[PDB]
Design a binder for this molecule. Structure first.
Ligand SMILES: *[C@@H]1O[C@H](CO)[C@@H](O[C@@H]2O[C@H](CO)[C@@H](O[C@@H]3O[C@H](CO)[C@@H](O)[C@H](O[C@H]4O[C@H](CO)[C@@H](O)[C@H](O)[C@@H]4O)[C@@H]3O)[C@H](O)[C@H]2NC(C)=O)[C@H](O)[C@H]1NC(C)=O
Ligand SMILES: *[C@@H]1O[C@H](CO[C@@H]2O[C@@H](C)[C@@H](O)[C@@H](O)[C@@H]2O)[C@@H](O[C@@H]2O[C@H](CO)[C@@H](O)[C@H](O)[C@H]2NC(C)=O)[C@H](O)[C@H]1NC(C)=O
Ligand SMILES: *[C@@H]1O[C@H](CO[C@@H]2O[C@@H](C)[C@@H](O)[C@@H](O)[C@@H]2O)[C@@H](O[C@@H]2O[C@H](CO)[C@@H](O)[C@H](O)[C@H]2NC(C)=O)[C@H](O)[C@H]1NC(C)=O
Ligand SMILES: *[C@@H]1O[C@H](CO[C@@H]2O[C@@H](C)[C@@H](O)[C@@H](O)[C@@H]2O)[C@@H](O[C@@H]2O[C@H](CO)[C@@H](O)[C@H](O)[C@H]2NC(C)=O)[C@H](O)[C@H]1NC(C)=O
Ligand SMILES: *[C@@H]1O[C@H](CO)[C@@H](O[C@@H]2O[C@H](CO)[C@@H](O)[C@H](O)[C@H]2NC(C)=O)[C@H](O)[C@H]1NC(C)=O
Ligand SMILES: *[C@@H]1O[C@H](CO)[C@@H](O[C@@H]2O[C@H](CO)[C@@H](O)[C@H](O)[C@H]2NC(C)=O)[C@H](O)[C@H]1NC(C)=O
Ligand SMILES: *[C@@H]1O[C@H](CO)[C@@H](O[C@@H]2O[C@H](CO)[C@@H](O)[C@H](O)[C@H]2NC(C)=O)[C@H](O)[C@H]1NC(C)=O
Ligand SMILES: *[C@@H]1O[C@H](CO)[C@@H](O[C@@H]2O[C@H](CO)[C@@H](O)[C@H](O)[C@H]2NC(C)=O)[C@H](O)[C@H]1NC(C)=O
Ligand SMILES: *[C@@H]1O[C@H](CO[C@@H]2O[C@@H](C)[C@@H](O)[C@@H](O)[C@@H]2O)[C@@H](O)[C@H](O)[C@H]1NC(C)=O
Ligand SMILES: *[C@@H]1O[C@H](CO[C@@H]2O[C@@H](C)[C@@H](O)[C@@H](O)[C@@H]2O)[C@@H](O)[C@H](O)[C@H]1NC(C)=O
Ligand SMILES: *[C@@H]1O[C@H](CO[C@@H]2O[C@@H](C)[C@@H](O)[C@@H](O)[C@@H]2O)[C@@H](O)[C@H](O)[C@H]1NC(C)=O
Ligand SMILES: *[C@@H]1O[C@H](CO)[C@@H](O)[C@H](O)[C@H]1NC(C)=O
Ligand SMILES: *[C@@H]1O[C@H](CO)[C@@H](O)[C@H](O)[C@H]1NC(C)=O
Ligand SMILES: *[C@@H]1O[C@H](CO)[C@@H](O)[C@H](O)[C@H]1NC(C)=O
Ligand SMILES: *[C@@H]1O[C@H](CO)[C@@H](O)[C@H](O)[C@H]1NC(C)=O
Ligand SMILES: *[C@@H]1O[C@H](CO)[C@@H](O)[C@H](O)[C@H]1NC(C)=O
Ligand SMILES: *[C@@H]1O[C@H](CO)[C@@H](O)[C@H](O)[C@H]1NC(C)=O
Ligand SMILES: *[C@@H]1O[C@H](CO)[C@@H](O)[C@H](O)[C@H]1NC(C)=O
Ligand SMILES: *[C@@H]1O[C@H](CO)[C@@H](O)[C@H](O)[C@H]1NC(C)=O
Ligand SMILES: *[C@@H]1O[C@H](CO)[C@@H](O)[C@H](O)[C@H]1NC(C)=O
Ligand SMILES: *[C@@H]1O[C@H](CO)[C@@H](O)[C@H](O)[C@H]1NC(C)=O
Ligand SMILES: *[C@@H]1O[C@H](CO)[C@@H](O)[C@H](O)[C@H]1NC(C)=O
Ligand SMILES: *[C@@H]1O[C@H](CO)[C@@H](O)[C@H](O)[C@H]1NC(C)=O
Ligand SMILES: *[C@@H]1O[C@H](CO)[C@@H](O)[C@H](O)[C@H]1NC(C)=O
Ligand SMILES: *[C@@H]1O[C@H](CO)[C@@H](O)[C@H](O)[C@H]1NC(C)=O
Ligand SMILES: *[C@@H]1O[C@H](CO)[C@@H](O)[C@H](O)[C@H]1NC(C)=O
Ligand SMILES: *[C@@H]1O[C@H](CO)[C@@H](O)[C@H](O)[C@H]1NC(C)=O
Ligand SMILES: *[C@@H]1O[C@H](CO)[C@@H](O)[C@H](O)[C@H]1NC(C)=O
Ligand SMILES: *[C@@H]1O[C@H](CO)[C@@H](O)[C@H](O)[C@H]1NC(C)=O
Ligand SMILES: *[C@@H]1O[C@H](CO)[C@@H](O)[C@H](O)[C@H]1NC(C)=O
Lengths: 429, 120, 124, 120, 120
């Protein structure tokens, strides 16, 4: 009765892992002016963030670009010498005691038979109290890898990157406003390329990301498993104002044939600690919303407590971020010190470092040239990364950057188009 | 009316947008992009080679001489082509697909040899 | 309730032309193939012409093959037949009927499900 | 008589050298060599896919069922085909191209469905 | 029954495995691998283009209108097909190949123009 009929151009697909390419406005494809989203009126599909390979590709490309940008920059190997460090001749407040040191050293110069005396200011965190010879201290990473100076012409602005499908593939987007990262999504659309995602690198407080459309959303791979992180997306931003209120004079020297080293010469005015401001009421409302949602996963007649990280190094116990090119490490214990049972602002002290590792790696370091003048930046807190220990206790986490990327890519899936298929009809040759 | 727009529609409707999907099959830093272009081409060519083997070259809708052994799917036309979407159909008869492809290949080989002996 | 209503012509002279039309209601017009069946006043039924539901494929009996045009308009739910050279032998009742063919993703037909009442066409 | 030798000749003459041009469409330091080879393939395949969509697969000359609306060009058959080269023709009807391609696509889809029903 | 299994068999037997071989034609460090993948595609496409030129597109066994000038191989159809393997045949008639291919192209060009002139 019925015969096999072959159809080509059949609108079906399978889950797939393929190579994605980027587009933007060091460079790849020009940003596509029109993503051409297609609604797919009756398509329901299953999404599963945390098993999403788009995350791994974003991870690898961001790190690779970071490394490529340092290839032509000065390698500060002539500076791994003993230092002679003493205290700073200025008005230093208690919060800065001691925090800074005035270090002199013998630098190489343009000619090999010449040497020069240079002194500069260092943060205590960038030096180690060793040597114990004629001199006191050496630079932190001259016992692991050599430091590379970032080129002064290169900014670290998080310019957004779009991720585009290759021919034969498509990206499906979940538009369900209540989607928690996994399972069926009743409203799915097809796009050619994702929206631009800003490669913002930070730890416990996610900055400048997307907000939830209606309500705070708590997403976790396994909510009852303390080994998993909890990504909390806010439906409202919390504004945070960060500053480094010290007017730096930046000087430079040649350490070799075309190799210029940058350093802080001195500080104009009083010396004060860098800090960030979070409005107090706003923060209290934000937590109240988070608590209401946590109570839907945990017992309702419960107690939710917030606490500061219990340990690890500066990279994970603080809020790490880039503010105007400087690297801040802010103490958030002022944000996560409360218990919730059934024009004020919060100031977060911030530490500054010039020699950073960025990624969780051993063999690389970077020196961030100090910046002339005074730095101020304003960012939006768009989500939190929390971990969990009656009374449930939550603490800031976020050491693995993949989680920052998951908070933006959770709504996208890659599928392979399989246009060939068969079905019975009455038609025969 | 765009790419995969008909994916949630019934097979009897979706069969009219075959050109929409067919047109979306073709088009160190920069190497992975070149690799992606090469593999997209290879997948395209394999589908075209297979259609050629079955005698479906050059067409989007190809009728054959192989019958539908009910053991693969015992649903009637006015279920398959009025209710199910191609995605639900593909899942239903995913298992018994290599069997169908094998039958289509044999059918075409018999047809090519029969024709050679009718042009004699 | 399915209805097919012929709104045809009347008495015409041989060698001229006459156009019939049939309006349909009660079902999706576009889902069905349609045909015209003829009945001379003293005779049985004769199939005359068939048209596919999308209007692309038409078939005729040899006796009218070079003379009749069968058409369709799916926006107006209308079937029509234009007859030329009107032989006296074409006097008959012309019935509008639904069925006679399927579209090869559909269950088969090859019979007629619905009938109109018929237009009477008389050729002098 | 070689590649593009007929470019300066009239359309009615040039049409006899279609195989000459068709045969010349195929075949970090050095990476650009691969990029060039890959794009040559991609362009070739797009032309072949398009001929497939229109039902012209496998032919260099393909007649269709789409009629020539005079608005595209009202020149008579012996002002086009023995008084005008292909280069001048392409310029004459450049704007009205995507229209024609769209019509050809629709024509073939109508043709494929009708045929299927006739083979029931 | 596998790839090239029929290589030692007679032409009259080997011709039944054409799909076996056809399916084995498709599928700084890493560049030589891309080069290998690209050339596999280019060789495939050239064979397909040539079959298209000759009017053999979409089929594995193509009859033509070109006759066998005995000066190519004056052997008879119980020797060529029952006593010779494709490898031996290919060697016998390797000299006179770019004559046969030229004739096949010419024959098809005439067939296309004759077919257009009939469809008028
Ligand atoms: C979250 O989003 C906000 C809003 O976009 C973002 O704040 C922006 O940060 C950039 C970088 O610090 C600011 O850009 C600078 O603006 C000053 C204005 O005086 C300019 O002078 C700067 O130019 C000098 O430095 C460049 C190198 O960085 C040189 O290339 C240049 O030649 C100059 O010497 C530079 O343009 C921008 O103004 C703010 N925007 C606002 C509204 O304040 C914040 O950084 C994001 N947060 C995170 C964590 O990413
Ligand atoms: C139609 O199929 C039956 C059984 O189908 C088998 O199982 C189905 C689920 C699916 O996988 C089919 O492709 C399988 O063939 C056939 O009956 C059997 O056929 C096989 C050979 O194909 C034979 O070895 C068995 O002994 C047969 N008996 C059984 C177990 O039913 C039947 O021959 C197929 N008919 C047609 C028209 O192909
Ligand atoms: C043939 O062309 C005329 C003119 O159409 C214009 O030029 C064409 C190349 C194309 O660009 C059209 O979109 C242009 O309008 C057509 O006449 C007009 O067609 C449009 C669209 O159908 C319609 O809105 C106008 O009312 C028409 N005007 C007239 C004078 O009739 C004509 O329809 C074309 N015929 C065919 C076979 O498509
Ligand atoms: C069949 O071939 C004969 C012999 O042709 C020679 O061998 C062929 C394989 C090829 O290499 C030819 O070019 C050789 O000439 C043909 O007889 C000759 O044909 C050519 C034209 O092709 C002509 O110039 C010669 O004068 C002819 N005479 C000889 C014996 O050399 C014969 O015409 C061919 N028949 C067909 C069907 O084309
Ligand atoms: C760091 O130490 C240097 C000396 O090595 C200080 O520089 C001198 O400052 C005095 C004034 O107090 C001047 O008279 C000298 O000429 C300066 N010497 C040089 C080489 O510049 C410097 O002021 C100290 N800086 C801080 C912040 O303590
Ligand atoms: C580079 O120097 C640092 C600082 O001295 C080393 O870290 C210390 O290691 C000792 C054990 O040998 C611990 O007792 C200290 O508490 C560590 N200090 C800090 C601040 O963590 C580091 O191991 C050295 N790296 C290499 C490669 O030798
Ligand atoms: C962050 O908040 C502090 C308050 O805790 C602000 O400090 C005040 O700034 C004004 C204006 O310069 C001074 O008059 C007050 O005396 C300061 N108060 C204290 C306690 O120091 C600070 O300006 C805010 N700023 C940011 C992020 O730049
Ligand atoms: C943020 O500041 C608080 C002080 O308010 C630090 O908390 C103290 O940590 C020491 C151990 O180093 C404990 O002995 C004290 O009892 C803690 N004080 C309080 C009030 O709890 C905290 O360690 C700092 N966190 C970071 C990341 O710098
Ligand atoms: C099509 O089938 C519908 C369900 O009935 C039955 O189950 C399917 C799987 C077939 O095996 C069929 O033969 C059985 O009747 C019926 O409701 C529907 O009426 C059937 N329609 C037609 C056109 O037969
Ligand atoms: C073809 O027409 C010639 C004159 O061309 C006129 O103008 C061109 C631009 C077109 O619009 C064309 O249709 C017009 O007629 C005549 O000189 C020539 O003899 C005609 N040839 C034929 C075959 O009729
Ligand atoms: C095919 O040829 C067979 C052998 O024929 C002889 O040997 C070959 C090598 C040539 O030299 C030929 O001229 C000789 O006559 C015949 O036994 C057989 O019948 C032939 N078959 C046909 C169809 O011709
Ligand atoms: C340090 O503070 C004293 C007041 O205690 C002031 O007289 C002196 O000028 C200040 N020095 C600097 C470098 O600001
Ligand atoms: C230098 O600063 C440290 C830390 O604040 C302090 O303990 C030490 O006594 C100071 N020494 C001098 C000479 O000022
Ligand atoms: C997310 O929602 C799905 C709905 O089916 C549920 O099964 C899953 O447990 C939820 N996961 C979390 C972390 O809330
Ligand atoms: C979550 O972790 C617990 C650990 O005891 C395990 O029993 C449970 O099955 C896990 N749930 C999921 C969804 O992985
Ligand atoms: C940040 O600075 C703006 C002025 O640029 C001010 O209106 C806003 O209140 C400040 N935000 C916080 C949290 O202090
Ligand atoms: C934060 O919410 C708690 C709810 O128990 C309330 O007691 C506390 O006063 C609130 N603080 C602010 C600044 O609103
Ligand atoms: C939790 O308590 C609220 C009232 O504060 C109630 O509306 C909600 O349904 C309760 N949820 C559960 C799981 O008991
Ligand atoms: C938490 O709040 C209490 C209020 O009594 C205060 O004593 C304590 O120092 C605070 N802890 C932190 C880390 O700020
Ligand atoms: C730093 O001090 C210098 C003194 O010459 C002044 O020109 C400059 O504007 C100051 N910068 C800031 C940010 O206060
Ligand atoms: C924070 O969100 C508001 C939403 O109205 C937006 O206007 C503002 O630019 C955002 N701030 C940053 C730093 O992106
Ligand atoms: C989706 O299903 C509804 C019936 O619930 C139907 O009316 C609509 O046309 C369908 N849309 C598509 C794209 O198939
Ligand atoms: C299609 O689905 C609807 C809802 O399940 C059902 O009422 C109808 O009978 C189905 N039609 C057929 C026969 O496939
Ligand atoms: C397809 O095969 C899998 C694995 O044997 C089996 O679990 C599933 O039931 C099969 N489905 C069908 C359609 O028979
Ligand atoms: C160039 O024009 C002349 C004159 O009409 C003609 O004889 C010659 O064949 C043309 N050249 C080509 C390549 O057609
Ligand atoms: C070319 O066109 C012109 C203008 O219509 C005409 O006079 C001339 O005869 C044409 N020549 C040929 C060879 O068609
Ligand atoms: C095509 O359109 C452009 C812009 O309107 C115009 O300049 C050009 O002359 C047109 N060409 C044709 C072939 O009509
Ligand atoms: C090999 O040759 C022998 C005759 O010597 C024949 O019987 C056998 O079938 C041939 N084998 C194959 C694979 O063709
Ligand atoms: C060809 O035929 C001869 C007959 O003597 C036989 O010996 C030889 O093995 C055959 N060769 C093949 C390839 O079958
Ligand atoms: C082909 O030509 C070469 C020329 O060297 C010759 O050796 C060979 O035997 C010829 N093969 C045949 C006769 O096909």
């Amino acid at each position: 009765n019925l015969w096999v009929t072959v159809y080509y151009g059949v609108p079906v697909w399978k889950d797939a892992e393929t190579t994605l390419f980027c587009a933007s406005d060091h460079a790849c494809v020009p940003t596509d002016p029109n993503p051409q989203e297609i609604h797919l009126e009756n398509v329901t599909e299953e999404f599963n963030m945390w098993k999403n390979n788009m995350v791994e590709q974003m991870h690898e490309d961001i790190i690779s670009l970071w490394d490529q940008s340092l290839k032509p920059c000065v390698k500060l190997t002539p500076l791994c010498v003993t230092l002679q460090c003493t205290n700073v001749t200025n008005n230093i407040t208690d919060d800065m005691r001691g925090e800074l040191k005035n270090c002199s050293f013998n630098a190489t110069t343009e000619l090999r038979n010449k040497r020069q005396k240079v002194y500069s200011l260092f943060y205590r965190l960038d030096i180690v109290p060793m040597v114990d010879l004629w001199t006191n201290y050496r630079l932190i990473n001259c016992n692991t890898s050599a430091i590379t100076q970032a080129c002064p012409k290169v900014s670290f602005e998080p310019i957004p990157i779009h991720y585009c499908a290759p021919a034969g593939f498509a990206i499906l987007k979940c538009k369900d406003k209540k989607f928690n990262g996994t399972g069926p999504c009743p409203s799915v659309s097809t796009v050619q390329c994702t929206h631009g995602i800003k490669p913002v690198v930070s730890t416990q407080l996610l900055l400048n990301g997307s907000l939830a459309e209606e309500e705070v959303i708590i997403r976790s791979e396994n909510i009852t498993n303390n080994a998993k992180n909890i990504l909390v997306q806010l439906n409202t931003p919390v504004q945070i104002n960060c500053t480094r209120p010290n007017n730096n004079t930046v000087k430079s020297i040649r350490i070799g044939p075309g190799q210029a080293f940058y350093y802080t010469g001195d500080i104009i005015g009083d010396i004060r600690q860098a800090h960030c401001n979070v409005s107090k009421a706003t923060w209290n409302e934000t937590l109240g919303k988070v608590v209401k949602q946590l109570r839907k996963h945990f017992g309702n007649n419960t107690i939710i407590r917030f606490a500061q990280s219990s340990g690890g190094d500066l990279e994970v116990t603080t809020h790490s971020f880039n503010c105007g090119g400087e690297f801040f490490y802010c103490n958030t214990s002022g944000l996560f010190n409360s218990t919730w049972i059934s024009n004020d602002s919060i100031t977060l002290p911030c530490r500054i470092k010039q020699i950073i590792n960025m990624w969780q790696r051993i063999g690389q370091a970077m020196y961030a040239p100090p910046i002339q003048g005074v730095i101020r930046c304003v960012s939006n807190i768009t989500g939190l990364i929390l971990t969990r220990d009656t009374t449930e206790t939550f603490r800031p986490g976020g050491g693995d950057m993949r989680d920052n990327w998951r908070s933006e890519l959770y709504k996208y899936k890659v599928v392979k188009i399989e246009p060939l298929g068969v079905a019975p009809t009455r038609c025969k040759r | 009316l765009g790419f995969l727009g008909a994916a949630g529609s019934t097979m009897g409707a979706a069969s009219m947008t075959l050109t929409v999907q067919a047109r979306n099959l073709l088009s160190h830093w920069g190497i992975k992009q070149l690799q992606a272009r090469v593999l997209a081409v290879e997948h395209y060519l394999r589908d075209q080679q297979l259609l050629g083997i079955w005698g479906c070259s050059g067409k989007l809708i190809c009728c054959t001489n192989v019958p539908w052994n009910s053991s693969w799917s015992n649903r009637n036309l006015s279920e398959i082509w009025d209710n199910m979407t191609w995605l639900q159909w593909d899942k239903e008869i995913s298992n018994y697909t290599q069997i169908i492809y094998g039958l289509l290949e044999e059918s075409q080989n018999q047809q090519e040899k029969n024709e050679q002996d009718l042009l004699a | 309730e399915v209805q097919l209503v012929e709104t045809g012509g009347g008495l015409v002279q041989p060698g001229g032309s006459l156009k019939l039309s049939c309006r349909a209601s009660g079902y999706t017009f576009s889902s069905f193939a349609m045909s015209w069946v003829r009945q001379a006043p003293g005779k049985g039924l004769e199939w005359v012409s068939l048209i596919n539901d999308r209007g692309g494929l038409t078939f005729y009996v040899d006796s009218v093959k070079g003379r009749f045009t069968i058409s369709r308009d799916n926006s107006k739910n209308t079937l029509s037949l234009q007859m030329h050279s009107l032989r006296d032998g074409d006097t008959a009742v012309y019935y509008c009927a639904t069925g006679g063919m399927s579209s090869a993703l559909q269950s088969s037909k090859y019979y007629f499900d619905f009938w109109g009442q018929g237009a009477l066409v008389t050729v002098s």
